[PDB]
Each structure stands twice: as structure tokens, then as C-alpha cells.
């Protein structure tokens, strides 16, 4: 009971060559997983004719609450329509029955988010495993940069991990909000709320740190918004105990004060693939006692 067809002429006719028939996809509402706020992600299974099956993630939101921030839901998940990279979260399809709230469907990521996975104490990552995860994000990021796509919120909490341990870059979902992830933000974005690919590089450097500390919160002591004063003092995150020297050097390049002096994602894949190849997988990374329980 909503005059939908009023979204966009040759702009939102996308849900078409992207939609799928419920005649091949079920929904399991009881068992959940996603509920950080909006998009009450569930579970589900799609079908590929007579045999091929598949597990999934289904996130949705409100309804009769007008369409203002409701069209930005369909238009967000559609952003993935042309995101075909092993290291980037993909769009399975789109289906909205003649009475079912705005439904978004994604492939299931068994190991959840990169940050929770690495913080898990029953897991025993090696320096190599972690450098490998960073290399995969760099690869997906290189794809996105190639599309002139600006992420704006690159963080380990926003990367997914599947059953083969393939990292998928994503976004679990304004230039002055408190929700602004200022601790991943480059100096120039904190000052002028402008985001670029060079500002995702700075953020990538912080993600490498989260990786080498196994999900430690950055700048714990400065639990604020006023990180700009702290940074302009001549400060940077410190080298984690298990982070190789050549890798911390890459991090400091990512945090170059001059955005254009920062390496490109293509240079990062290159530099990190080299550092990664030198490891055999005999170095275990342990959790820092002073970061334990720190949020
Ligand atoms: N266990 C499990 C939980 C899951 O939760 C979710 C996790 C993430 C999303 N993200 C989303 O809706 N879209 C994108 O991220 C769009 C996008 C893609 C690439 C970019 F670079 C920027 C934005 C939705 C979820 F449901 C999914 C699968 N398995």
C-alpha cells in the first residue's frame, strides 16, 4: 500500500535486473545474528534450479514510516550491484513480496566480522595469518579505488570473514555526527569533513594496527572526539609487540601528513604481499594484557 513506482526512472529501475523470485529463497526469522540496531539480519536459503542451494544473511528495517530514510535502504544495498571482487561483500539479490518490509539479502559470512574473529581467544592466529587478512583488505580496497569508490569507514569491524577465511570488505549499513569514526579518520577529514581514497589509506593503516594487536581499540586513553589535538602534537599509534618492523613502516606511510605522499592501495598490495611471503607461520600473536577488557 505504498506508491513505490515513483522512486527513479532510469535511476532506480535497478532492483529489477537485481531482483529474484521468492520461489527459490526461504527465510528463517527466529534464529538471528544481526541486531546492532537496524537491519534485523536473519538467515535463509536460496535455490539455483534443481540442486544448488545456499545459506544467507537477510537484513531489513521499518515500513510505513514514510520513505525518506527508507529509500536510502534499497539504494544502499544496491550499491553492491557491481561489486564483483572476491575481497568485497556481494549482493545476492533483491526481493520484496507484496507485503514484506524492505528486505536485503547477502551471502552468509560464517566467521562474522574481522574484529570479533581476531579478539576471540579460542583462535590462534599467526603473524602471517594477520598480515594475510591485511593483504586481502588491501586487495578489495584496490578494486574499490579502481571504481573511484570512497569507502569512508574502513575498519576491522566492517570486514567480513567467510568459511575459507576470505575477508570481504563491507559496511554494516553526515559530516559532523558523533557517530563519526574519528579514530580511523585522517587529519584532513577531521578538519574538512571531506573524504577521498587517500583518506581510506590512512584508515587502512589503522586497520593493520587493529590486526596486529588482535582487535585492540585505537588510542584507548583518548576515548574522545578531540583526537585532532593529540595527532597534531606529533603522535601516531605505537608499534604492536607482534608487528614486524617493515609493516609498521607501511603504517607510518599510510599516516603521512600529506595525503598525496601516501601510498596507493595498489602500492600497499605490492608492499604487503612481499612482507607476507617472508613468513612461514611459526609466530603466534598473543593478546596484550593491558588491552584486555579495554573497549
Ligand atoms: N554472519 C553474517 C553477517 C552479515 O551481516 C551483514 C554485514 C554487512 C552488511 N552490509 C550491507 O548491507 N551492505 C554492504 O556492506 C554494502 C557495502 C559493500 C562494500 C563496501 F565497500 C561498502 C558497502 C549487511 C549484513 F547483513 C552478513 C553475512 N554474514
- Nine-digit cell at 32? 538471528
- Residues 135, 100: one domain? no
Among candidate residues 176, 178, 207, 219, the one with its CA nearest the CA of residue 194: 176
Three-state secondary-structure class, residue 261: helix
For the chain, how many helices (H) and strands (E)?
A: 8, 6
Do both 120 and 255 map to the same domain?
A: yes
Co-location of 77 and 132 in the same domain: no
Q: Is 201 domain-assigned?
A: yes
> Residue 174: helix, strand or coil by DSSP?
coil
Look at phi and psi of residue 235 and say left if phi exceeds 0, alpha if psi is from -120 to 50, else beta.
Answer: beta
Looking at the structure, tell me whether residues 218 and 136 fall in a common domain.
Answer: yes
Q: How far apart are CA 138 and CA 32, in angstroms?
A: 30
The 3-state DSSP class for residue 3 equals coil
For CA atoms 77, 81, 82, 86, the dihedral sign is: positive
Mark which of 47, 82, 108 sits at the end of a domain. 108
Burial string for 47-83 (b: 16+ CB within 10 Å, else e) reads eeeeeeeeebbbbbbeeeeebeebbebbeebbebeeb
**Number of domains, the chain:** 2
Residue to probe by mutation, ligand 1, list 170, 181, 197, most atoms within 8 Å of CB? 170
For ligand 1, pick from 36, 41, 56 the residue to mutate: most ligand atoms within 8 Å of CB. Answer: 41
**Residue 114 lies inside a defined structural domain of this protein:** yes
For the chain, the residue count is 295
C-alpha–C-alpha distance, residues 217 and 239, integer Å:
14
> Largest Cα–Cα distance in the chain?
63
CA distance 56 to 105: 7
For the purposes of burial, counting CB atoms within 10 Å of the CB of 1, is it exposed (0-12), middle (13-18) or buried (19 or more)?
Answer: exposed
Centre of ligand 1 to C-alpha 106, Å, is 7
Does a structural domain hold residue 273? Answer: yes
Distance (Å, rounded) from C-alpha 273 to C-alpha 135? 7
Q: Are 114 and 160 contacting, i.e. CB atoms less than 8 angstroms apart?
A: yes
What are the beta bridge partners of residue 55?
45
Say whether both 286 and 243 belong to one domain.
Answer: yes
Domain boundary (108, 138, 169) is at: 108
Pocket of ligand 1 (CB under 6 A): 33-34, 39, 41, 57, 59, 77, 79-80, 83, 88-89, 104, 106, 108-109, 112, 144, 151, 160, 169-172
- Supply 125's cell numbers: 592466529
Report how far residue 233's alpha carbon sits from residue 236's, in angstroms, rounded to the nearest whole number: 9
Q: Is the Cα dihedral 265, 268, 273, 274 positive or negative?
A: positive
The CA distance from 102 to 73, in Å, is 8
Choosing from 43, 78, 108, the residue where a domain stops is 108
Q: In terms of domains, do 165 and 192 share one? A: yes
Angle (CA) 48 51 55, round 5°: 60
Q: Which resolution in angstroms does this entry have? A: 2.3
249 and 152 in a single domain? The answer is yes
- Report whether 167 contacts 114 (CB < 8 A): yes
Domain CATH number, residue 50: 3.30.200.20
Based on the domain organization, do 167 and 246 belong to the same domain? yes
Question: What secondary structure does DSSP assign to 200-258, as a single string?
Answer: HHHHHHHHHHHHHTTSPPSSSS--SS-HHHHHTTT------TT--HHHHHHHHHHT-SS
What are the helix (H) ranges across the chain? 71-77, 114-119, 127-146, 187-191, 197-212, 227-231, 245-254, 265-277
Method: X-ray
Do 101 and 139 fall into the same domain? no
Q: What are phi and psi of 55, to 5 degrees?
A: -90, 155
- Find out whether 205 is annotated in a ligand binding site: no
C-alpha cell at 165: 577465511
The pair phi, psi for residue 261, each rounded to 5°, is -85, -10
Rama region for 279: left / alpha / beta (φ>0; ψ in -120 to 50; rest): beta
Name the phi and psi angles at 81, rounded to 5.
Answer: -45, -45
Count of C-beta atoms within a 10 Å radius of residue 281? 11
Closest CA to 114 of 224, 181, 204: 204
What pairs with residue 113 in β-bridges?
160
CA-CA distances (angstroms) from residue 8 to 5, 16, 216? 8, 12, 43
Quick one: which of 36, 145, 30 has its CA closest to 83? 145
| Annotated binding residue 37 | yes
Going across the sheet that includes 52-60, the strands are 45-48, 52-60, 103-107, 93-94
Domain around 53: 10-108
| CATH number of the domain to which 146 belongs | 1.10.510.10
Check 82, 153, 200, 245 and give the catalytic one: 153
Active-site annotation holds for 153: yes
For residues 274 and 211, state if they share a domain: yes
Amino acid at each position: 500500500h505504498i506508491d513505490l513506482s515513483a522512486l527513479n526512472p532510469e535511476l532506480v529501475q535497478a532492483v529489477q535486473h537485481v531482483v529474484i523470485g521468492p520461489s527459490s529463497l526461504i527465510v528463517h526469522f527466529n534464529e538471528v545474528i544481526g541486531r546492532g540496531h537496524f537491519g534485523c539480519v536473519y538467515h535463509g536459503t536460496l535455490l539455483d534450479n534443481d540442486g544448488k542451494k545456499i545459506h544467507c544473511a537477510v537484513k531489513s528495517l521499518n515500513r510505513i514510516t514514510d520513505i525518506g530514510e527508507v529509500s536510502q535502504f534499497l539504494t544502499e544495498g544496491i550499491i553492491m550491484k557491481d561489486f564483483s571482487h572476491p575481497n568485497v561483500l556481494s549482493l545476492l539479490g533483491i526481493c520484496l513480496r507484496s507485503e514484506g518490509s524492505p528486505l536485503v539479502v547477502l551471502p552468509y559470512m560464517k566467521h562474522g566480522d574481522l574484529r570479533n574473529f581476531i579478539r576471540n581467544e579460542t583462535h590462534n592466529p599467526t603473524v602471517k595469518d594477520l598480515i594475510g587478512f591485511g593483504l586481502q583488505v588491501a586487495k578489495g580496497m584496490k578494486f574499490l579505488a579502481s571504481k573511484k569508490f570512497v569507502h569512508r569507514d574502513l575498519a576491522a569491524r566492517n570486514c567480513m570473514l567467510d568459511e575459507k577465511f576470505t575477508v570481504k570488505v563491507a559496511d554494516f549499513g553526515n559530516k559532523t555526527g558523533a557517530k563519526l569514526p574519528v579514530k580511523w579518520m585522517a587529519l584532513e577529514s577531521l578538519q574538512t569533513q571531506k573524504f577521498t581514497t587517500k583518506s581510506d589509506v590512512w584508515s587502512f593503516g589503522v586497520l593493520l594496527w587493529e590486526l596486529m594487536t588482535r582487535g585492540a581499540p585505537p588510542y584507548p586513553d583518548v576515548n574522545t572526539f578531540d583526537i585532532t589535538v593529540y595527532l597534531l602534537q606529533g603522535r601516531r599509534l605505537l608499534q604492536p609487540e607482534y608487528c614486524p618492523d617493515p609493516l609498521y613502516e607501511v603504517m607510518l606511510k599510510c599516516w603521512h601528513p600529506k595525503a598525496e605522499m601516501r601510498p596507493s592501495f595498489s602500492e600497499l598490495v605490492s608492499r604487503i604481499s612481499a612482507i607476507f611471503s617472508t613468513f612461514i607461520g611459526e609466530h603466534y600473536v598473543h593478546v596484550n594484557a593491558t588491552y584486555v577488557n579495554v573497549k
